[PDB]
């Protein structure tokens, strides 16, 4: 399965098994025996607009 979304820059540390915070609490929660991989890259020029 591939899940996709957009978050802040310093919220990428809550996408991991066993974390807390406004993102992992109630936006997107990863089980505690996760198996896959997590990939993330900056996208300032595409998603941020004056």
């Amino acid at each position: 399965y591939a899940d996709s979304f957009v978050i802040r820059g310093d919220e990428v540390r809550q996408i991991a098994p066993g974390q807390t915070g406004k993102i992992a609490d109630y936006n997107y929660k990863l089980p505690d025996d996760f198996t896959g991989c997590v990939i993330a890259w900056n996208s300032n020029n595409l998603d941020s607009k004056v």
Partner: protein, 46 residues
């Protein structure tokens, strides 16, 4: 009426072992406490 040490000895050895078994329910073995209601109250499941 005024010698049964073999029997006494047996009856005793068993009590000394059963007490040592229960007295081990209060050691940490390298944990924060000896109570499961204390590790299930100040720690998250992971």
């Amino acid at each position: 009426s005024s010698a049964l040490g073999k029997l006494q000895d047996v009856v005793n050895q068993n009590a000394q072992a059963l007490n040592t078994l229960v007295k081990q329910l209060s050691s940490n073995f390298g944990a924060i406490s000896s109570v499961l209601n204390d590790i299930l109250s100040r720690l998250d499941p992971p």
